[PDB]
Symmetry: C5
Subunit: 346 residues, 5 copies
């Protein structure tokens, strides 16, 4: 029979369907099953404490008033324009900072109704979500980004969100991040919000992200080591080259301070000490100590042969003493940060 007649006969004023009334107005709560498909992930900014995602959201629920038997087809697709005339849950995101739909040629929405009365709703969304980040162990850090799906207006007596038993979260093939590696273990947990207005359903997903070290090695760790070796070079210069040694020391100190200031150019102003901060502090301490060493040598050398051998012995000892202690510092630093890094992500 004519397709157009069936639509309004089922969902029209003649039938009496009301899109403002729940499938069971007084009865067991509506159970909504959800799954998400992630199409792109990125734009993770530490400064603005947020990340941007683009996902497909699928919702499933049963509406007994939409049960159709006469029509032959088991499953019926529909037009996006008729979404306004069916009841839909009022899902919202708690950590939502920015949100928009897509209207490129039509509304990017899908609806499907089955014989039993089950409804499948799929929509395309772009959301910028907020993510609290801990900046300790900043180079060697593992972050967790959450996404919370909640009901704004319906209490647990009316609406109950649940996760799909198989494949709640899948990621698009070939998705990669420049600075992070997305782990394949996704955490599903139950959250419930309590307010002065009542109890509301909530569901959450946690994603584990591991920072990549290559950029930080090429950028920060290696030039600091080069400056330390450059300061070490001064021990092999003649003690009579006072302007040369002083200029080398001053240049190394100023360069170290500038690099230390610039190492936090793209981070939020936190109030604790990071590992990169410890590293720059130790390197600045080494360069300053080398300059103070030459200062002491120059002070000792002008005290007039006993003073000549005493000043020379300091240079000879420091030529084989400064690299060994720095090697010990590197062993103690790099080991314990893989012990703690290996600590369970949870």
């Amino acid at each position: 029979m004519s397709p157009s007649d069936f639509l309004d006969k089922l969902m029209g004023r003649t039938s009496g369907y009301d899109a403002r009334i729940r499938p069971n107005f007084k009865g067991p709560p509506v159970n909504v099953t959800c799954n998400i498909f992630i199409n792109s992930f990125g734009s993770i900014a530490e400064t603005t404490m947020d990340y941007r995602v683009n996902i497909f959201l699928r919702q499933k629920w049963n509406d007994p008033r939409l049960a159709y038997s006469e029509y032959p087809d088991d499953s019926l697709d529909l037009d996006p324009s008729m979404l306004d005339s069916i009841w839909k849950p009022d899902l919202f995101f708690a950590n939502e900072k920015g949100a928009n739909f897509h209207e490129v040629t039509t509304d990017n929405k899908l609806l499907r109704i089955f014989k039993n009365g089950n409804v499948l709703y799929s929509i395309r969304l772009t959301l910028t979500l907020s993510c609290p980040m801990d900046l300790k162990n900043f180079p060697m850090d593992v972050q967790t980004c959450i996404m919370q799906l909640e009901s704004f207006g319906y209490t647990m007596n009316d609406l109950i969100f649940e996760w799909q038993d198989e494949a709640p979260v899948q990621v698009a093939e070939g998705l990669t991040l420049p600075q992070f590696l997305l782990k394949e273990e996704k955490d599903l947990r139950y959250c419930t919000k309590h307010y002065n207005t009542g109890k509301f359903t909530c569901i959450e997903v946690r994603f584990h992200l591991e920072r990549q070290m290559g950029y930080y090695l090429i950028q920060m760790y290696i030039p600091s080591l080069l400056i330390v070796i450059l300061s070490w070079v001064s021990f092999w210069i003649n003690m009579d080259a006072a302007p040369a040694r002083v200029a080398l020391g001053i240049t190394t100190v100023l360069t170290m301070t500038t690099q230390s200031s610039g190492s936090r150019a793209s981070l939020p102003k936190v109030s604790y000490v990071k590992a990169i901060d410890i590293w720059m502090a130790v390197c600045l301490l080494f360069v300053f100590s080398a300059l103070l060493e030459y200062a002491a040598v120059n002070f000792v050398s002008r005290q007039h042969k006993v003073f000549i051998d005493r000043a020379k012995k300091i240079d000879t000892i420091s030529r084989a003493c400064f690299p060994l202690a720095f090697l010990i510092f590197n062993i103690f630093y790099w080991v314990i940060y893989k012990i703690l890094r290996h600590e369970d992500i949870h």
Copy 2:
């Protein structure tokens, strides 16, 4: 009885409800009780003199025309789509610079009507509010951010806003700020605006924010101290190392000036002197005075044995004199800024 019939029987042309007429058209003023829930706080920028907040706003008032007795349920939830057909107050924010609603899957709005005729309206909002800031005592400062809720069109004869006796403001659990600590004492006060058009109701809330010092210590205070000690190092060098001493002095002076210029990179161009400015001025004075000291020593030393001991005595005195006076300056500086910092926030 059928749910759909009750809605239009109560709020329809048949009933005669008009959403453009107040609950008591000629009578005592409408009393509206409000409470806010803060879901996220952040984005406090000194340059643009504003901060961004995301809040839930709850309004309560009594409408005698909505009193329902026949229906069994004590409390009735509704659909967000029917908000257009009820009377709502015209609340606006005085310090509102930017505002938007949320439409992620539906309107993020709630409405509830009680048997007596009381209405509860809840809406989700994102607002960028303006906050005048005083930048004196800039590192050790306590700010106050206000939010004013006002009626645009109704005078005190018609509309009166009030605060809830219990729990007007609550904050979401676990909310933290990178650079600030939100105090738990919230100030509620009465504001009334007077214009040439009449008298209007207003309510205000004040939040106290304390800046965190860790970032400023790691960033500004410690490198300046390092430069001061670096300039102090020059007193232990031989007086005959004129190029070395002059280069050290010049490098320290230029570095100090660059750091002083860069200490105000992210602040509005105010016209008064801050504490950080006093600190950089004192450190620049110390480095310049050290350079002038060596200048005087070099001038004295070429005046040809009396001139030799006289020039040496200056170096020996300055080696134990410069750190003591700087220690006294640190004692006087750091104490009085905790005395004044302890001054009552109000």
Copy 3:
């Protein structure tokens, strides 16, 4: 009598009111009186040549078709939703670059009708206005920001805008600007635009803004003076310290050039010479002249006792000659810029 009946009886198809027809279709022009209230002012950017304001706009005119006598109340407030059904003038801003309304909970609009037929319309607006700026005397400058209100579609035969005799412009209490001081004298003048389409009404307001000097003194003027004194220090060094003196001269010259380049970091690329540019040019000239002086001294000293006293006399003269001429330059510079600064703002 019932409130709802009066509204549509007065402004309905039964009455015959047409919102597309002027109050007097063929007759004397409509006279509109306007006043503005300024709620916030700021965001003055020299680069983008514009400033942002947030104002309340009040319009008053007489509509004989809205005269009501029967109803008892002298003055009737209304609902913002009914603005579409009354005639309103088509005011627009000539220097309008950006504009938006406010819809935080309702339309931020007010309407009031009186017994005689007078209408008061109040609306909240945010406008980014364009302001041509003259950058000569850049530190010591007084700017003028204009705002023009014009009719887009109605000629002088139909619409005539006028200013209110008392209190056209008032500013909110406690409004302050970080870098400017808003003067309390506001200029009201008559503007009329002439085009190929006809004659149109226009009204304008001029605001006087005075720049604050504290920021520029702390930032630019004092470090340049410090560099000049640092270059002056070289005159007291021994003439045999050639590397030290040359390094001091080069460092001062390079620092001066860098500061001169950085003094125009946040300004439009104008093609004339500003006062700050004259100041940096004079300081660069002083440092370069000092370096050329030492160059001449070094050239003279190697010409082999007559040459020894001749080279020494230059250093002794320059030690008491360079500060005096710089003091004379400061007297001539600072005086005449207060003479011209005192010139009437108009």
Copy 4:
């Protein structure tokens, strides 16, 4: 007779006017005459290769179905709200990157109909247009900004755009640009676009913009000359001041390289050589050649009286030889760029 009746009698379902049908459905093409008024011009960015303009657009065409004779007035203004009910051309801009209307209090639109059936439509628009720029002769360049007006849906059989015989383009009085001078000769030409869908009408206007040199002289050309003179200063220093001369050479070379890198901070990454690039290359060559000269002198001087006079003669020749060749370079550079600059703008 009543004004309201005439409007719907002329343009209503009773009359039979259809706004989807052209004035002559089958017949000679519709001829549309256009003129533009420029109210503000600016925001010319080389990086984003675009500029922003704000214009008034006037369109004129004849509609025989709108001919009115009975009503007395020769010319009838209308309300902006009735624009939807008349046929309008589908003009679009080819180089349109961004576009928006203005709705400050009403739609900024005008419509006027004459007795013969002629229609005048005026609208206010803000458009960011794309402009391909040639960066050779970058300081001394003349650009051309185009604007193309085209029909999206109508072929030449239906719609034909033309320019007004008198005053197609006029500019608002007092309009000025910070970095450019707008020439008073405007080029009007005929463009026709050919696609696989048919032939479409197009009209274009070309504006000539001349860059101002004052900013570039104060910023780039003069500090480079100062660095060249600073390098020249080294020729008058004693040949025994090896650290001083080497430090001067190195500082000049590094400063020149930094200025050369910074001279292209605000330009697109083009792949050809500009005039500023030639200038910096020549100045870097001069400083490097001076350093190589002192290197050769120092190498020659240690070859042990014949070697003493030979090394001294190089310094004496270079003291009067380096400025003369640089003067010749300035004569050859500055002349030919005014010869080519004088080349006809077309």
Copy 5:
């Protein structure tokens, strides 16, 4: 016959056309042929990993319900306003990050219907598409930008997208890019997406972009070579000029490190080694090795005639040894990157 009657007689409730039903509701799938015209291309940003394009999109399909025979004209243009009343495919872009229509004076849309029932739909779009980029061989790289057109709601049984046999992609004449060259070979391929909801049609186009080297040569490669030659200059200085040689070495090392840090100012933080990174590493190694060479020479020279000739021989060998090895490095570097660059783009 009257034009207005034909439109609603064909597409009206009287006819029974339903825009929610496919041309063949139960039957062979609808075949849609598409072609795109590119009007502007640009805004390729490595950081935000995306590019902006402005295209014309043409869709063709057959609708048997729109077959018209009586009317004389073979082809009928229409009005953009009637697009809502015809069935249109639900095309969407997979890599769509931002999208907007154009409404400058009317909707920039075209529709045309033929006698047989074929429909042509043309629309103007602006889309910011995402493009994964490989940054190895960063200066000498060839990128590929994709665009995927997919159906959101219809499975392969209903909708099938295909490419036009002649001229699927054409580019506007004279289109050029500042940093890239668009290749004239466009790749057309078949993509099919598989999800848990079904099978969906997809089509893709690949564009090949070649980076231009001129900017990188003028900017990075040549100053690094200048610094290397500047470090080479030190071999011709006297071994007794210890402050001069040490200062030259330190300045070259610090400049090299700063340039290496600044070479990645506008790139995403990738974790692999690029060619520019190899180049800067080799140049830093050369400057550091030169400084270590002078350090060894200075250490050897103070070991007290055998030590004099031994230290001199190192300088003489290094004066003809450092350029030859650097030339060999340039030959090996530049050749193999043209071998690999010549590798087929696919």
